[PDB]
Amino acid sequence: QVQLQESGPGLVKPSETLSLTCAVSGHSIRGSYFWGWIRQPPGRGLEWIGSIYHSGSTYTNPSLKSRATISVDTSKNQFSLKLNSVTAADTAVYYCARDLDIATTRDYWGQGTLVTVSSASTKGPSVFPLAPCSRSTSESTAALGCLVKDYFPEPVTVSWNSGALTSGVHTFPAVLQSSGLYSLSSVVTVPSSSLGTKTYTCNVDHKPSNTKVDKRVE
Amino acid sequence: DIQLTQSPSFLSASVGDRVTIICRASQGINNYLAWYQQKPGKAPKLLIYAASTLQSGVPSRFSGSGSGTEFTLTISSLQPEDFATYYCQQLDSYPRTFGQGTKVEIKRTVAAPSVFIFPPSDEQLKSGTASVVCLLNNFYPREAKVQWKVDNALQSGNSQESVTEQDSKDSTYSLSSTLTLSKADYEKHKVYACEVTHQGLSSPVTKSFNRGE
Amino acid sequence: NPPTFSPALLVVTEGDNATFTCSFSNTSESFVLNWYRMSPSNQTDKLAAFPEDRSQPGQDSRFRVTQLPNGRDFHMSVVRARRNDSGTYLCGAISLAPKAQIKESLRAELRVTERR
């Protein structure tokens, strides 16, 4: 079908310009559809920002008309958003889409990209193992984990055994510490039977700081 | 411009329940309205367009009705995987507008948490801070109390917790609580305990370890 | 201004192409055109959508829609018309922005006659 991918900085300083690009795959932007930007502040609703026709004709949300520009490059099958004078109010997941209309049965959305508006510097996490004080087969199920501490900005990703272990995994929402840095815990429940024999590694990715850590949990 | 009023804001309903979600348009928009399902960390996914046309491939338990100003999304028989925020989008005009959203959570039988405690790693203690972690695994409802005890002293103001989004299979939550101490403060005390209160427990469950093992 | 669909009556010999013209103006650059035949049940059966990126995957090649140079007139042709193509046809014009609107033409009749 059609695939869309947002790209651009995940951290912008207040008063600067947020720039995002949307790469469209599987069909040309040249055609009869509108191509839109939609944002969602953390835990809040969807706000349409603006849409563009392949010709370059735009519609913009009246609340953002003073600050937002939608552009299209049919030469690269991409369209783009510029948002001037950003504030904490502009912290959101930004989505690009093929806009639904009354003349079709289908639309398409990107996965979304988080943009944090903050003066705070990028910091990579420390990764600490979560293991019981003493290993025991006393009950069927045991918990292991990784503490991903003191990073900025969001997000981090955590897999287990390079994505081979998915069953019983819980990756918690990050908590903002008083320090202004994030901390995240990822845990997995496994047969206590398996702790002696099978190996358990968390794979932590913090793209903003170019941090890739593999922590063996014992 | 079209304004949309979506109700309700949040609902908890049991597997098999009929769920009713309404969007009111500020003026007549014919049947130019679509319904979306948004799972946490994912893009909104189209269910229904032209107010009442189910997109081919979307489960048949989803239906839409209405034309003019009053639009209804119905889930005929709520399933655990239907945990999501639901949004209407008007297709009548630019500027595009969405409803405020309806968060749907699954009501299920009470399930007591499985509790685990983790001491700070030797690697962390070197750096001068101690993180003690308590895990409450696969419980319902979401409401749960974690009380940290250090040599039987009740802790306050030095813990933070995080809760998973409701599980799409078993409709349970998990919760992590982290107690933060300086290395010096950690080394002053022996017994680290996490006490858990929950509707599924007749009395609190405590998991503990002794520093120095 | 709903689209016009002309001729009102079109009489062609079986084997000839049966070509209607769908016309509309005063609409934005962002439009969709639909071509319908009226079914026995008085239901619109969609023959073709324009442009090509609006077409249903199974759209029959014998229903050809062409935008003429002036950009407001569109040929809608039944290639090698058969007796059983005789019936009632119309076009729908959809404006997408800034206000989305659907307007149908008045119906036109096609009569496909026996070749002597």
Numbering used by the authors:
A (entry chain A): 1 to 218
B (entry chain B): 1 to 213
C (entry chain C): 33 to 148
Give the authors' words.
One PD-1 and one mAb059c molecule were found in one asymmetric unit. The interface area was calculated as 757 Å2 (538 Å2 in HC and 219 Å2 LC), and the heavy chain of mAb059c dominated in the binding with PD-1. Among these, R86 from the PD-1 C’D loop forms a salt-bridge linkage with D101 from HCDR3 of mAb059c, while the Y33 from HCDR1 stacks in parallel with R86 in PD-1, which serves to orient the arginine side-chain21 and aids the bridge interaction. The neighboring residue D85 in PD-1 also connects S32 in HCDR1 via hydrogen bond. Similar to the nivolumab crystal structure, the FG loop of PD-1 in mAb059c complex structure is also involved in molecular recognition by mAb059c. The loop fragment A129-P130-K131-A132 behaves in a bended manner, aligning with D92-S93-Y94 from mAb059c via one salt-bridge (K131-D92) and two main-chain hydrogen bonds, as shown in Fig. 2c. The P130-K131-A132 fragment in the FG loop forms hydrogen bonds with mAb059c and completely blocks the PD-1 interaction with PD-L1. However, other residues, E61, D85, and R86 of PD-1, which are not in the regions on the PD-1/PD-L1 interface, contribute to overall binding by mAb059c to PD-1 and prevent PD-L1 from binding via enhanced blockade effect on the FG loop. By comparing mAb059c crystal structure with the nivolumab or pembrolizumab structures, significant conformational changes in both the FG and C’D loops are observed. In particular, the FG loop shifts ~9.8 Å away from the one observed in the nivolumab structure, and the backbone of R86 in the C’D loop shifts ~5.6 Å away relative to the nivolumab and pembrolizumab structures. Additionally, the N58 glycan on PD-1 is shown to interact with mAb059c, with a binding affinity ~50-fold higher than that of deglycosylated PD-1 with mAb059c.
Subsequently, the PD-1 and PD-L1 pair was discovered based on their functions in T cell activity regulation, and monoclonal antibodies targeting the PD-1/PD-L1 interface have been designed to competitively block their interaction for therapeutic benefits. In the present study, we report a 1.7 Å resolution crystal structure of PD-1 in complex with the Fab of a novel fully human PD-1 antibody, mAb059c. Purified mAb059c bound to human and cynomogous PD-1 proteins with an affinity of 36 pM and 45 pM by ELISA, respectively. mAb059c blocked PD-1 and PD-L1 interaction with an IC50 of 1.6 nM (data not shown). In summary, a new anti-PD-1 antibody, mAb059c, with subnanomolar binding affinity that targets a new epitope including the C’D loop, FG loop and BC loop is described in this study.
